Amino acid sequence: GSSHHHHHHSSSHMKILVIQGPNLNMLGGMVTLDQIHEIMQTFVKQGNLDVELEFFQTNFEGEIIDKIQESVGSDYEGIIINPGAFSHTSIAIADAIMLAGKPVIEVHLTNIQAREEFRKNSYTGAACGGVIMGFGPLGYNMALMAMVNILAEMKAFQEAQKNN
Amino acid sequence: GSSHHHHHHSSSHMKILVIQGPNLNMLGGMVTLDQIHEIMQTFVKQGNLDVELEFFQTNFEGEIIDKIQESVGSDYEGIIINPGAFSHTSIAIADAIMLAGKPVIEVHLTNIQAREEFRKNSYTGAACGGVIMGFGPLGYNMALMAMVNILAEMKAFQEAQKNN
Amino acid sequence: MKILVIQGPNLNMLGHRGMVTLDQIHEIMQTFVKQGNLDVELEFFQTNFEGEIIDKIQESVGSDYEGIIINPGAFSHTSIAIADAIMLAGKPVIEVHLTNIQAREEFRKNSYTGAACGGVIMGFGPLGYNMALMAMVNILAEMKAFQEAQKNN
Amino acid sequence: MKILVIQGPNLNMLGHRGMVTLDQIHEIMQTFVKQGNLDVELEFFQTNFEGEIIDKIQESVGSDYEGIIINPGAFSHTSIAIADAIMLAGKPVIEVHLTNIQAREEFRKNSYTGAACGGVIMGFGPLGYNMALMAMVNILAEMKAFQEAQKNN
Amino acid sequence: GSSHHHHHHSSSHMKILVIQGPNLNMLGGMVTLDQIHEIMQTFVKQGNLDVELEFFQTNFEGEIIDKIQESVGSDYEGIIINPGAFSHTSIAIADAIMLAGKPVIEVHLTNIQAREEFRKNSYTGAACGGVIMGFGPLGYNMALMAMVNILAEMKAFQEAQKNN
Amino acid sequence: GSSHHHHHHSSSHMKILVIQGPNLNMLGGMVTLDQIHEIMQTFVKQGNLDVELEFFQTNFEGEIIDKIQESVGSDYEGIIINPGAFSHTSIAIADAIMLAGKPVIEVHLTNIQAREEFRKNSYTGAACGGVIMGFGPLGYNMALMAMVNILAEMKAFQEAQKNN
Amino acid sequence: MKILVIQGPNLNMLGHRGMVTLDQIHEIMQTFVKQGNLDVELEFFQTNFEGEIIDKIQESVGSDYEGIIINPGAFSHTSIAIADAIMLAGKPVIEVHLTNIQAREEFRKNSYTGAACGGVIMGFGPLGYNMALMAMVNILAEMKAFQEAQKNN
Amino acid sequence: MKILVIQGPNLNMLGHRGMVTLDQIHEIMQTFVKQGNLDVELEFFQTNFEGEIIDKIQESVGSDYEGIIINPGAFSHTSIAIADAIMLAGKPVIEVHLTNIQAREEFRKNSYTGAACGGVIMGFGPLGYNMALMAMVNILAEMKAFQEAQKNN
Amino acid sequence: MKILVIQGPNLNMLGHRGMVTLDQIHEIMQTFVKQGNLDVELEFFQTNFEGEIIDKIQESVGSDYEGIIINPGAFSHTSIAIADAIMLAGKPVIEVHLTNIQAREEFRKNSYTGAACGGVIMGFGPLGYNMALMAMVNILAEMKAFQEAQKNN
Amino acid sequence: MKILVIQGPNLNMLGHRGMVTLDQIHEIMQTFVKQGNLDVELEFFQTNFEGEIIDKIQESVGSDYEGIIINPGAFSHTSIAIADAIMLAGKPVIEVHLTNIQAREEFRKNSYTGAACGGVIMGFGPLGYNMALMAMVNILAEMKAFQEAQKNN
Amino acid sequence: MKILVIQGPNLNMLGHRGMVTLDQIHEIMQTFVKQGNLDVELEFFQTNFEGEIIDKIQESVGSDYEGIIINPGAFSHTSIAIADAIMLAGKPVIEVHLTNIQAREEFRKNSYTGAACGGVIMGFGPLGYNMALMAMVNILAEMKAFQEAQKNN
Amino acid sequence: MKILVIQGPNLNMLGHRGMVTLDQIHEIMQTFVKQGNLDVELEFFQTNFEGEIIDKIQESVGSDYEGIIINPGAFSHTSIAIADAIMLAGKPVIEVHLTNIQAREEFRKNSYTGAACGGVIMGFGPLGYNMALMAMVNILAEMKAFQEAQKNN
Numbered sequence A, B, E, F: 001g002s003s004h005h006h007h008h009h010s011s012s013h014m015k016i017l018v019i020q021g022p023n024l025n026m027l028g029g030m031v032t033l034d035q036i037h038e039i040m041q042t043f044v045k046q047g048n049l050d051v052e053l054e055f056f057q058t059n060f061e062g063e064i065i066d067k068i069q070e071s072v073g074s075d076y077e078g079i080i081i082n083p084g085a086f087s088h089t090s091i092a093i094a095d096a097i098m099l100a101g102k103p104v105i106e107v108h109l110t111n112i113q114a115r116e117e118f119r120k121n122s123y124t125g126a127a128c129g130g131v132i133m134g135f136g137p138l139g140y141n142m143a144l145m146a147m148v149n150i151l152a153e154m155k156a157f158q159e160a161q162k163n164n
Numbered sequence C, D, G, H, I, J, K, L: 001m002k003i004l005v006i007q008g009p010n011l012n013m014l015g016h017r018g019m020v021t022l023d024q025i026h027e028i029m030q031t032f033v034k035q036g037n038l039d040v041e042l043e044f045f046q047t048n049f050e051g052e053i054i055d056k057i058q059e060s061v062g063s064d065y066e067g068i069i070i071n072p073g074a075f076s077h078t079s080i081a082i083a084d085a086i087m088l089a090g091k092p093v094i095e096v097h098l099t100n101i102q103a104r105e106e107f108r109k110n111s112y113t114g115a116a117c118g119g120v121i122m123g124f125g126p127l128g129y130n131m132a133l134m135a136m137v138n139i140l141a142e143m144k145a146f147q148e149a150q151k152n153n
Ligand SMILES: O=C(O)[C@]1(O)C=C[C@@H](O)[C@H](O)C1
Pocket: A082, A083, A084, A085, A086, A087, A107, A108, A109, A110, A111, A112, A119, J080, J084
């Protein structure tokens, strides 16, 4: 699958991993995925945020399981995923996620509540703590704004108990 | 039911309506709903945002339907709603929302995908364009950040077609 | 001879939700009575509250109302309470629907409230309301004929 | 202005199956027209055959009938074909039920034929038939008003 | 449809009506329907029984409804029916039977409990007071032996109450 | 459980085993089970039939499984059973029946098609080749008349292939 | 020691809906207490409003009520909200039903509210209410014993 | 006045399965009677056999037992037979459950045997048994008043 | 070599129900045969009667028809009878659908009759009928080759 | 004019899984084209990977393929992704099945991918593939006629 | 070290129901122990009675049995009681199936008793029994190692 | 004598997901063979890819593997394709589960893959793998005895 990433300088620093599910490579709303990624980057460079993104799209469920598994070599501290149609079917990823080790957030462009009966459950989303759907590309940024706060708060907490 | 609101000065200006469902008046995480509201207000005064909020909680499905119906006296231009347990059952509010006239966003503290079978469907969120669940109080701000962008883009659009 | 019309949730919103208001439906009804020359006091009550329909039906049980026409709206599909209430009304209740609830989503198909009513008119738009007057008038006429047929022998 | 009434299976059996016959229901209808002074030719057709209802509706598609009132009876719950047929009728079809099919066994609850018709009258006993005439008259009146409203501008 | 009948002399006399559903006309076990009928007649002429049968097969659900409706012109006093595949689907005959006026018995060559999930319910058999299935042609005679006893007992009963 | 039997002389001879389900011991229509048994006996002594019955009622599902297993010590050559409510639940007896080795017929006084949803399936009857239900006590005799014919025809058949 | 009794929709209609009123049920309870010599202030509240049950339970959370006996009635089967409420009451809630809701239609079988309450009495007619007092008295007694057993060591 | 208490499968295991035995439950009952000054012979029977419950209920039908309290345990959810048995007992049967079967797995939610019983106590732990005595006493008392009210006129 | 084509309910209504008649479909087939130079007598039969499909299939069992192409229409989803009939035809039956019945409402998804046929063509509009001829020709050809392959050794 | 043939999981196993290989199926197609004198480049791709079907479909979206024939095999029943893919292919997709998936286990009945494709051929054994060529040829021919019919006026 | 083997209904019938008896299965087990040189007293108990399995498991709770291997047979699918029992066994219970219950009718797919056991062997024919011994030996060995690892520190 | 072990998705993650790795499981197996003195070449393959399990099984069909042990993991519940593949393996496949998939969520209860396999070991943790070797060894031994029993007469 496909993979973009930007760099980051070196003076906290939060590495985040975005995983885009099958067919998401194809948007082209009238907006494209690369565009959804600059929107994300634009919203960080902009928010004033020491966040590094890694972007990842694939059509292969195994490639999505692999990628999560990699992350567990503690690099990035959280995952933003839109499993595509795998949301509805794939227990195997739901499992990947539950032994992800870190925050995961599911994001869906459409409102899957409001579509075909079959799209209504996501197993994957049941396993991410949080789920965003319905918002169009705008949803990713919500997942980003959220991710930031989660991690932040965790850092402030790991520094909480680890003194006494 | 109960209702808070802050004021706003008079020099665009977006009035937004927050509706909290039944039992939400009870939180006291270890955070309370008034607290969830200042967090919201804090995130506006802070984001630098001409947004006026109105906060509203009730245990009464009718009172939720009433309030939406009132909004349709074009004041506020969108709604953020956590219908609580009424999400799962109440077609009547789903209906209220589908003839709401404006952007509606559903917010849930818990991740309802991940709870009892009965909590899995929300008819109301199938009628809001977008849904947020899973995020704790943080979710509300996501709905706020989103609401802003929606309206914004709408204003920019109503000014789009209305020239030619 | 006085009849109660009970309109459910969202029904008041007609004209934002064809382009016709609930007020206009009510006056249509008048026009049908005021015209059909039928001795009928109508009263309109609309609410978005399940409890307020229940209350109102419970309040009917005192003389002056001989029948209730009701569009429980969305509560039709879900409100076992309103159906329970309709059954103790002990007097004609007729359920009306603007649309054909057979013909929309799954969750609208069944009506609890409808089963409790003697009979259901649906998918006629407002005409169904006049249809309901039409029937109420008949049943009340017939009932009235019968309790004099017997309480005479 | 000529209207078709289609009665489904078993319906002819009324008086062995209250104590009233299908014939009487028909003449009631007459009495309602013959009385309501409405220019309406009615025709009655009863059958226990799914195919015969389908045939009859397909035959309506030729002028002289402007609308159909129909009680598919038991076929209501099961006949996708009749429903399909009612949908090409391209002219008002109104479904009538003597009983409230909401209020009997599970298998009667849905009506396929009902969904295809614009609207459904149920649980009124025979009155529902007059109810149906009442509606048909109105829609045909309105339709007629409209095709002259436009085909004038 | 098709229709066989034998005659009977004139010196109680029980007229019985057998109705064979769709496709039953086709057997040819390695036994045919006419054969199933002689077996029946053979078992009456044989049992020593003042019974007159009328045999009736059709493919048309309407024709089965018609025939029952006819019977209600009190000729025969009971019906033996194998609705075939219409068992499982046809409410309309179930209804015909429920306002049949007299004893009805459903017979099935096969054991419908023991076949495709769809064959498991018969609505028609739910409305007959009794149901035989599983016995092959032998089934019909069971229905005949039973029909005899039912009617008999009824005659003995109508003569029971109608004296006092 | 309980068990009746009559004797039989010694000059073909068919031994048959009747098994009555739980609660059947309680009838007392207005007829009792012993009565249902003499009706049976009466219909054999009467039909002119070299049949020996053994009657058996119990409340214990094990005791029914036991008794079938016993039969397999080839005594009687067929079983008539009314598993009572165990019809609907007990796979374990359905299995006993399927490795019964001989004709089994299920009899039910009521018409189980026409009762509570739960009584609609009988797993046992799915395993008997044939099922009678709806007939009141008269049902048993139908099972008897049938049993006779089945066995008969089998004897006639075992003498069929066993010559060439 | 003060206990709240919450009666649900339609429950007030007893005497039109055997031949006994809600008032009579309540005075029965009194008679059981007034007689049982038990230190128990009772309060009765009946409503046809889902919200008002919720509000009332939430209002209990302030001292003087130590327990709630509650017949959610129709809301029993459908009201996640009231069950959610009962769960934060943090103090005994006992559900009562006049009838045996196992023993009616499908839709009454489950109770959401019952699952949230510790225990459910059903099918006893009014006796079940005294039954409920019986139990509340016991749990409160035991709880009270225990918080003194511990807050002593 | 003699009452039969029937304990179902595994119920004898209490103390390995809070920390209380079935013996203790039974003596509690005694204490409640022995104390309530109520003329009540109790008998206890516990079994892991569906058949033995059936047999025991059928055996009750002979004089000296006027009522049955019964915790069918696991058989509650599956035993049509025991429910059929309970229904010919012709004499009060009350189901008790230690836990609130609404509040566990799907498969425990319905009780066949409970529907057959007049009423069900659940989720009270052992208290429910005394609760059951409480009720049986009342019903028997009332029944007995009534057969003398009538067999006098 | 003679083939039966069986069109089901409503299928005759094409041109009121794109803009193409059943007649045109049939002549298309001809054109495909008349052109494909294939020795094929075709016969067309359309009906709105479940029975008449059954009768027609049963009648095929006599020589001259070697195969059946059939669009049961609506009866596809419900007719166990027709499926049973197709299964004793003992000779190729091919089901055709204009539309892709996977792609409409739930109730059209399964076809009983289709499972009975050896193979189903669907969603091709009229082209599927020529598609069907295409197949029949092949199967008949192959079968014919084989009964000569064997009845030779 | 170039067409892509997509064979799904296990389909390569034909010859161990009648006694015919996937290679033979493909050369048959050739023979049908090579014979039908039709201007058609075919390409065969078989995979046991859901993703590789997806990738392959997405890769089609670049010129030279005008259509896809596809036997998703097992993924037919479960792969929402492939069905989603087929839907953006924006160019004819035809699903083929060797067997009649109506006629096996429950889980094979529905096909997600089939609903996505315009039309589905099933139960024909390998013939269905030639049947598929037959159809693709026709649609492409017709489409091509049409874009010249219009882009001329 | 003594182990209980519990065989359920019908299991004794092997050899009328491959051609192997229950006795032979048991002696096989012996042969595996007698051979594997494992210190293991086995006991065999077969029954057709749900209550007898329950009784036997309840009887295990006394010393000398350290583990149970069990084929509940048909009760697997239905007996909530036996599962309940297996849960208080407080000692290893292993479920065995001759066949693969996944691979037969719907009703056999789930096992209640299997969920209550730590682990299930199925579809191995008799070999599964030896498989079970193999496991029991291991867990007992491990448990035993552990209670000496700790009760030492 | 060489055997394939196929580990499914996530299985490699043991030690982040008791505290044991997949490597350790494999070496345990060695220890069991290396110890059991059995002539067995084992190979381990783990993948998170449905297609790779299917490929690997399809690759087995060439000599040197006589059997496959497999934990399809999450694909167990959903992969019709893998089950389809396991069925053409034409050689013993045994499914192993660390946990008791009966005893977790609904969605894990059924195994497609398991029904295709001859037999399934589950809920034993790693021991189940040695269990599997134990069985494979036996079947292969027996099969081998048999093809020499016959191909001798
Ligand atoms: O982002 C989404 O909306 C989605 O995950 C993408 C493609 C579809 O398969 C999903 O149902 C929704």
